[PDB]
Design a protein around this ligand. Structure first.
Ligand SMILES: Nc1nc2c(ncn2[C@@H]2O[C@H](COP(=O)(O)OP(=O)(O)O)[C@@H](O)[C@H]2O)c(=O)[nH]1
Ligand SMILES: Nc1nc2c(ncn2[C@@H]2O[C@H](COP(=O)(O)OP(=O)(O)O)[C@@H](O)[C@H]2O)c(=O)[nH]1
Ligand SMILES: Nc1nc2c(ncn2[C@@H]2O[C@H](COP(=O)(O)OP(=O)(O)O)[C@@H](O)[C@H]2O)c(=O)[nH]1
Lengths: 625, 619, 624
């Protein structure tokens, strides 16, 4: 013979933590139901020995855990699902429960030397026949749970909603104890009649109580009992074969809960071992019994990414940076040529032999200057810098996608933001110094034959491709409209011959006109622009030559100020940013991937179920002795 | 040629301090009534020298005090303390925030200020009616304010003075806005044929921090020589704020000294009565609240010391065993009296195993049922209540029987002291109890002793049962309910319930009777006749108690009786001056005591003052 | 050559500080307009590179100044039109713009090494034209119009392009910008840009400022992301966008280029406007204030000195007996009223002409008649009278000195001075008041009066009647000015037993006093000559006795109140003036309208000179 309800309540509360399980339901609890004003709060406060229950309607279920604490002469409260502990003032507790109703069971624990080791549930706002109410009656009123029906006595037992719902939840009254309140408001003759009832008979009988009337609130319950005890000692003979007073209920609940919880110990062990055996298989199959620490997972996957960036570092600083850059400046040259040269009516004049010393010989010399300045004073500093920045940021996205981090968005953003944070710190340093080192190209260059030659081959290839893009777009209209139907629209808009159709036709004219321009220029580049300082009024070659000088000088200052510094500092910064993440964030970050969430959640269950079972089995082995 | 107004005002002030007296009302005060939005505020603010009325950003009991070397102008609110308001902006707020028959007692102190007492009744006059009688009818001087722009022949503020004083002495007239009206019509206003007053009439004008003291000097300079520039247009007249003030000063001097003779009379009349009441009801015995509280607490402290002696011993042992007696009965009902085989326990010799086993098992469950019941907790709480109960008895026997606030402080500090030791006592008791949780020992000395107890315990139980049983016979019928009893045995309102109770009481009395016979003759030998539950349970109850009562005195009692006086004393010192008066005034006779002696002291102070002034004023 | 937009926008901001000019008007700014939900706030935020516009109702326009601050990677915002500078948190910028909408333009400036040098005016949403009193004003003068139009909407139905023709027929100062190019076919997009209904010289720009998918706004990420997608679409659809201007990059490039051309061309006419505006303001300054500068603080102090001068010049002269006379005026009026309050209403006043009395009771009745009269003037309460008289004398005279100075138009200063003066005088109130009643102790009786004092006494008492009963009778002449019937001796009788019945009672009182003073006049002149022997004329015994107290009264008025005032008043004033803040002094000075004009005119000249030095210099360089 030994009382282990303290331990059994720990098991129930442990099992209450396993996500969606009928395991905790197998361990009974004393559920309290009673009409509003039937004295239900009064009988509860009597068990606790203090006031804390506020008396609006539908206060919402209160999962009350009474825990006996040695060396604690005072009464304390704890709302764990809010990390609130050792509340010595019960007025605060009373208003906390009021603040909460402004179905979710309030997790509140009471700890004191006076209090017995119990588990109770305060079911509030009743039903007098006339959905959410249906849910609580299934969740709390069923299972092995003991029902405490609070009857007021100054009410007929057929009229009480408490006993009516009790028979509905039962009947036969095997797991129902009926408490009869306001025993003082009825003659001891009828009081004994109500208790020894025969309409609503219960296995765990009836208890008759009187509960009316620390120092201000402790003495309150002492005064209340003095009166209750008085009435019962005086009317002793009137209450033959009767269970009466607060003391006898505390006594009853203690006896019944021990019987109830321990009888449910073998059923719960079977059910736990059952869920524990299913959950072990799932672990060994989906995740091959591998333990997963979230902060570890997080850090190890960052090491992989940090490795990926070292691999990118290896194959980038090179002519690859020249390529990304020159490709952008190639497009600027093409724009400089269209906005200046290509639209000019006398563009054919450059292909001619004769020249007029003053007016026309200087016209092209001036044109070539503001075309060159247009490109050199364009903004190479910001361009180069903001170009190579996107390049890194983009390759980072590729590295992130080629790793397990492809499933974690919150991590991916951390990496991306911290990457741009690193890059930004050197934006000005890079951009400004790049502009300063590209100034010698802003006003003519003393280029060698070698420089001029390389530029010429590139310019030919540039215009080759530019012309091939225009012809294809011209042929695109030629086929989509009709070879002949095209000439109809073109000649009409031109007015040399005769809505949606005219748009295609007008475009086709521009393209027809462009190709002619690019053709007489491409042909010239191949047949004429051979000399350096002499053939200088060959824009395509000169512009490409200055852009070659601009690119090779920019890529060197991009490395020194931006590239090198990023590769060193980014890992160091990334690590710093990770250590800033609290345990909470890290779990959420890792739980993004549903496979990893599934992983985290399954082991949390396994460990909790293992904890419950160990406690149960050690108790069972002892109980079998 | 002395102006003892400062003292006469002082006398009026302290006579207003007495709970219920018409002595202060005898002493005159310049009551002011004026036309609403005319300039009722402006006229008063001029007398003082600063702005304060909430009419610009209920009745104000204004008390002007002349103070030496106080070049600055300060304000007091004796009812709200503060006592020094330099900046008059917060005074303006104070009169507006307080305005959200009650007199606002405001005091103004400065060297510019003359010695005067005034009352500011708002605008024109169940509430309005009382203000008209309370301050105007009495021997208090009246002042009327209006506006020159509105009808001058029709003045409600002057009409109210005519209604309260038709063709009377104590009245002073005031006319404002003299800049808007010509000096001709204003000449007929002062020496009027319509409303003549023996005190006189005066004409003035009030238009347009010390920026507020400059504002009064601007408005005074505004029309200083205006009364000079047209001397004939105002000859045989009382003109300017300077002479108005001089008038209020000299009239009050006489008015207050006129009323000084009947007041000294009425004071003595109301003092001889109060000194008679003190002589008859209290016998001139003085009452200091703090002293009364401490002296009565000392009496209570002694009552606890006297009880400490008459407690513990067997007196504590008796209460504990009586509660254990009830548990033995409850254990016996739950494990014996509701069992058919109860006779088998005596009648014949038990079987070789099964029958001996069952009855030996039953006393083990019953013993554990008693020992593992929760004695520690039970014991502690029994004695805890015992102290609180006796504490109330000591309280009701004393002078504190009328003082609930104290009774609660006492009952609270006691439970706090007892609570301090609850765990240590209960736990200690549960330890000394454990060696009795599974032990079949003792001797015939305590067995024969517990046997005799078991007889008497079953006896009084049978008595109470028979009584209740035979009492239902009277309520229904000896042969009437007897037939109704048999009606429930074959089928196996009030009468069906009373019958079902009687069926139980019948067999129970027969159950206790056969058990009583057993205990008498059969139960005798110690450990041999062990299966005599009522005896074994009485033996264990006598041990449980004896051991418990020892640690109840060790842990709980000794510490209570030592520490409780110390903490009670500590808690009383934590009471404020306001608390002490409230705690003591709870008894109506004690409230009467203080109320009377407060009036007595104040009336003696007024008289000693008023008398000495009369000795001077006659010479 | 160089791009002096940064310097040109600095000039435009100065020209926005001159309270009455069309100077800033002649310098270009990019006025942005577009229908609600067309990407107007989205295009501005792409240039800025940070989210800053609130998304509340969009009330008053935003004067958006963009400063390219070197070494500042971090994008910071400042609200110059309030004391709020380098704001790092753009949430607070968003909510400040929102708070400022709870019709002047909102002065907001963005600083960064990323942000270009640009002037922009964010005009309210919808731009329907219908009301648009802001649009008419801002879309005119030399200003570039940026017409934000969404591609998903027909160009003919665009609110921005409509107003652009309504303000600029022929697109000579309008840049068309077509947003939402991602909600339109690239062939149709090229169609919108290569328009013919609304063709513009400045061009059309196709943009995509779509956010594709929380420190994302702290850095330039959200923005980088939005551009990366935009750059993708125009690289993929490069083939379709032939002879088109596409991307935010090209728009930012265009805005920078165009603004330079615009601002530099508009520079030359603006200098001509500033030069005239300065010449006009310099002229007024020469002709109104002979080109003399004004320092509000210096001005006030200098005028205070002139005021402090008057008090010193008033101190030396006004002491002697000039105050003693003002005290004699308000003390002889009490010798006048000692009789009226007592001695006058006596019927036995006549029998003293006979000079026959009884040694037992007749010689006792007239002795205590003068003991009550001698105490009715010595216990009168002159302390408060003399002190507050002199206090008010000093106070009135101070206002005179203030009108005598330029301080006549500044009331706040006039208050400050008078407040200080009364405070200084207050600190000596009781001290003086008590000293006037302390020195009057043996003078409360009559032993102090001699034969020599009686000389001026008998004569100044007949001279008392002289001036007073002539000026008081001059006002008795003021009644016969208005009118006439009267009748006229009969009114007095039927009263003795409407309007004129009131003067009948006035006349009956005057008749009594006119005879009562006269039989005294004919007697006291040739009756009482002796000092100790003759003691029955109160008029001669009190008119000089009050003035014998008056002589002893001005002495202690000087000792306590007067000496201290003249000493401590400049000291306390100088102290009280230091307390005044630079904001308070400007407000105190700006009380006079001529001074408030002076301050404004020289401030305008200063700003105008500042701006011109900058314009003229830029022009010299540009003309080379
Ligand atoms: N007379 C009497 N009143 C009681 C008793 N028990 C509870 N009450 C009163 O019943 C009233 C309302 O019930 P309450 O205690 O709030 O419990 P509820 O049923 O949760 O509302 C309170 O005012 C209690 O004092 C009792 O046993 N006797
Ligand atoms: N011109 C002039 N206005 C006065 C005079 N007396 C009072 N007032 C005006 O009366 C108005 C309101 O009266 P107030 O002084 O607030 O006293 P209230 O009657 O308590 O409201 C103010 O605007 C005053 O300026 C006066 O003698 N001359
Ligand atoms: N698809 C697409 N949406 C855009 C584009 N530009 C802006 N938006 C969206 O257009 C909506 C309203 O535009 P907003 O910038 O507020 O224009 P405003 O109302 O004229 O200031 C916003 O929800 C933007 O996300 C774009 O270029 N493409």
């Amino acid at each position: 013979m030994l009382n282990l309800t303290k331990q059994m309540i720990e098991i129930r509360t442990i099992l209450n933590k396993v996500d969606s399980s009928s395991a905790h339901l197998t361990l009974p609890s004393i559920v309290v139901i009673g009409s509003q004003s039937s004295g239900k709060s009064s009988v509860l406060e009597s068990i606790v020995g203090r006031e804390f229950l506020p008396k609006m309607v539908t206060r919402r279920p209160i999962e009350l855990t009474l825990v006996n604490t040695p060396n604690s002469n005072n009464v304390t409260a704890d709302f764990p699902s809010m990390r609130l502990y050792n509340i010595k003032d019960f007025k605060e507790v009373k208003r906390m429960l009021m603040e909460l109703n402004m179905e979710e069971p309030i997790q509140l624990t009471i700890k004191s030397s006076r209090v017995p080791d119990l588990s109770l549930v305060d079911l509030p706002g009743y039903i007098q026949v006339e959905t959410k109410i249906r849910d609580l009656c299934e969740k709390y009123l069923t299972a092995p749970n003991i029902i405490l029906a609070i009857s007021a006595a100054d009410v007929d037992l057929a009229n009480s909603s408490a006993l009516k719902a009790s028979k509905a939840a039962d009947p036969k009254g095997l797991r129902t104890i009926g408490v009869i309140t306001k025993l003082d408001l009825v003659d001891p003759e009828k009081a004994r009649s109500i208790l020894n009832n025969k309409k609503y008979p219960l296995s765990m009988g009836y208890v008759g109580v009187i509960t009316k009337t620390e120092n201000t609130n402790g003495l309150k319950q002492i005064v209340s009992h003095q009166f209750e005890k008085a009435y019962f000692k005086e009317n002793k003979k009137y209450f033959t074969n009767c269970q009466v007073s607060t003391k006898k209920l505390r006594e009853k609940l203690i006896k019944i809960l021990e019987i109830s919880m321990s009888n449910a110990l073998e059923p719960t062990s079977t059910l736990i071992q059952q869920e524990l055996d299913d959950t072990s298989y799932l672990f060994k199959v989906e995740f091959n019994d591998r333990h997963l620490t979230p902060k570890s997972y997080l850090l190890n996957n960052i090491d992989v990414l940090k490795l990926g960036i070292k691999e990118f570092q290896e194959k980038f600083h090179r002519n690859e940076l020249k390529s990304i850059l020159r490709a952008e400046l190639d497009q600027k040259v093409l724009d400089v040529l269209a906005t200046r040269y290509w639209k000019d009516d006398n563009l054919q004049d450059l292909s001619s032999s004769k020249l007029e010393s003053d007016t026309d010989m200087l016209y092209w010399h001036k044109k070539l200057e503001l075309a060159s300045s247009g490109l050199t004073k364009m903004g190479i500093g910001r361009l180069s810098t903001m170009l190579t920045t996107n390049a890194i940021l983009k390759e980072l996205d590729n590295i992130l996608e080629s790793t397990q981090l492809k499933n974690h968005e919150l991590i991916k953003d951390l990496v991306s933001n911290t990457a741009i944070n690193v890059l930004n710190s050197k934006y000005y340093s890079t951009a400004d110094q790049v502009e300063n080192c590209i100034k010698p190209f802003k006003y003519e260059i003393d280029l060698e034959e070698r420089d001029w030659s390389l530029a010429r081959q590139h310019s030919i290839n540039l215009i080759k491709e530019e012309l091939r893009q225009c012809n294809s777009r011209y042929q695109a209209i030629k086929n989509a409209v009709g070879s002949k139907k095209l000439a109809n629209v073109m000649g009409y808009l031109e007015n040399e011959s005769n809505k949606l159709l005219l748009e295609r036709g007008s475009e086709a004219i521009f393209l027809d006109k462009r190709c002619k321009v690019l053709s007489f220029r491409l042909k010239m580049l191949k047949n004429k622009c051979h000399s350096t300082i002499e053939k200088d009024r060959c824009p395509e070659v000169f512009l490409s030559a200055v852009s070659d000088k601009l690119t090779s000088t920019a890529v060197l200052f991009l490395n020194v100020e931006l590239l090198s510094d990023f590769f060193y500092n980014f890992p160091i910064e990334l690590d710093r940013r990770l250590t800033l993440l609290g345990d909470e964030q890290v779990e959420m970050f890792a739980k993004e991937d549903p496979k990893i969430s599934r992983h985290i959640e399954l082991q949390k269950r396994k460990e909790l179920l293992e904890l419950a079972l160990e406690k149960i089995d050690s108790i069972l082995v002892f109980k079998k002795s």
